[PDB]
Amino acid sequence: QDMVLGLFFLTTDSEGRSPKGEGRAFGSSAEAIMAFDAGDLTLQAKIDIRFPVGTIPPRGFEPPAREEGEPEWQQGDTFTLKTTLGRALFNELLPEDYPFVDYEVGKKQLSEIVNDLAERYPKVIVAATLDNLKAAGFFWATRSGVTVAISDIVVPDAKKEIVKGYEGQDEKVQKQYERGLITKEERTQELIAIWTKATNEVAEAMNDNFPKTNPVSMMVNSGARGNMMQMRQIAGMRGL
């Protein structure tokens, strides 16, 4: 509910906010935190960051390396990396031997690495890492700024038009039932099918309207809690 929402905000790419200080190179992960404290850099922004000895790089980074005429073993020495400060912070929670993870974390990928840790590592490391994730997750859930307000739940603009078109479509069936050309039982089956199609159409219009940065969508896309049809009947029509 909260931990997964926090980590999703912490590890996500830019444009979620104003990505200030993006596209620059930093001497160490410590210096990035210095820039963040001053407010120049933001937590979600692509940056070039160096990395101390012993931190394993990504599995696909093992064949490529830096440009030198000599053989190199980049697996446990210095290496730059294209990432965001938040992803650098997140990886420090995981144990040191673990390879770097560079994608937005969500819920499915989050469950995977816990499952991966349980297989390849001793029990004590698994228990300790979850506590680190708990602390980081709760801390950033506060700073994430998810809320609810009357202006957060935006009704689809197109909706009003979409419902009226179906009503006119509906009404001919009602009209052609008044003249006896169709039985009521057949009419009920045909109307339910017509209405079911309508609920999907207004869902699609609403799903396009919402921006990815607002609270209500963010805590469903992340896998925190809720489901799409629940979000539909708060803003779009409930349906049958």
């Binding site: 509910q1 909260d2 931990m3 929402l5 926090g6 906010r17 708990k134 709760f138 801390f139 859930a141 506060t142 700073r143 994430s144 700024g145 998810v146 809320t147 609810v148 307000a149 009357i150 202006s151 957060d152 739940i153 609270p215 209500v216 805590m219 469903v220 925190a224 809690r225 809720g226 629940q230 979000m231 009947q233 708060i234």
Partner: protein
Amino acid sequence: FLEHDDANRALMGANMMRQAVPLIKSESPLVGTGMEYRSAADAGDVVKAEKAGVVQEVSADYITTTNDDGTYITYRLAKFSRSNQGTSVNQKVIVAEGDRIIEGQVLADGPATENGEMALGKNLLVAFMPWEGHNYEDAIILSQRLVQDDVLSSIHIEEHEVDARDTKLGPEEITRDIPNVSEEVLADLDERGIIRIGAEVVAGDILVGKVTPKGETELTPEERLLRAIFGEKAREVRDTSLKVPHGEIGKVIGVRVFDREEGDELPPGVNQLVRVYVAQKRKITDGDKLAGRHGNKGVISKINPIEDMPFLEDGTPVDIILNPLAVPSRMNPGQVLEIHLGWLASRGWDVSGLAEEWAQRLQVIGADKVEPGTNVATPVFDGAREDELAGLLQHTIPNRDGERMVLPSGKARLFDGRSGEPFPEPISVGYMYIL
């Protein structure tokens, strides 16, 4: 705002409101439907007048009124008498000395009532945000001001009694000379073996001393030796005195005694019956279930100090935090709607010569120029529409120095109390009625 709530959560919300306990000083809801007043007067707890007269003598225990013919009737107000579930039914007095009265007007306030209107709770400053995990999975965060300023605290009156019955071996005696007891344990007992009025008690304390008449004791040799050594007397009695139940505290407030030898009628066998009323003042603590009106409920998880509370741009710490993760999934956005209107009720609004469309329906209603603190009523299916609330939020009165702390969206800037650094984006805030 019932129409905005799901039917499932509304069921819980209506059921909860038959569980709210009365508080020390009841306060009318800032925003709420107009039916709460009628529901109080028709129920019998509030004391209304049967005549149209002039109040003549106002006092806490009783109030005297005089009708135009000349007849006097004195209403005797109940005061701190136990209910079936063990809550006070204390009655206040609302009218002054020389006020004119009309028939059916409310003379005395009741338990969980205010000016004749129903009042089951208080109205706190709520902010919607996760906060360090202390309000994870429906739990509540409360500022320590509420325990300090007695905002949520309730009297509780327990009553427990014993009977001095006549048995085969003899009668039980309600007496102070209990055997094998220290001197300091029976310190607050009165002369005849009843705890004095006002004597604060703890768990295990003796309320009324009582001793069984006899037992057939077949003494072991070691006990026989001990009786000789200590110069004791067996006294042919065993202690069966009434004692305070485990996990219970309180200040004694009243004792009733019924005697066989007196004119009082008793069941067969019982020579004497004594009942003791122990009353305590419970303060709001962790675990104490708290709830709103729209089926949102939780246990208190932590009571932060007033400094640690996330405060507003004018220093005002929010009295209660609430998780936003709960609201979308449970489908009760009525509580967010109530919050927005609650902020408007607390800090008034001005609409004069604005000539706006949403305002036009309100203009005949009269709810255009509203002062701070005043109540507003939204009936259960003809309530204010969402265009009005959006519009009303745009023009809230600046409370002090010329600024409006809440933005048009209904959200405000929150300064973190702990780390000091401002929260990165606005937070929804307003006034919510909490039971």
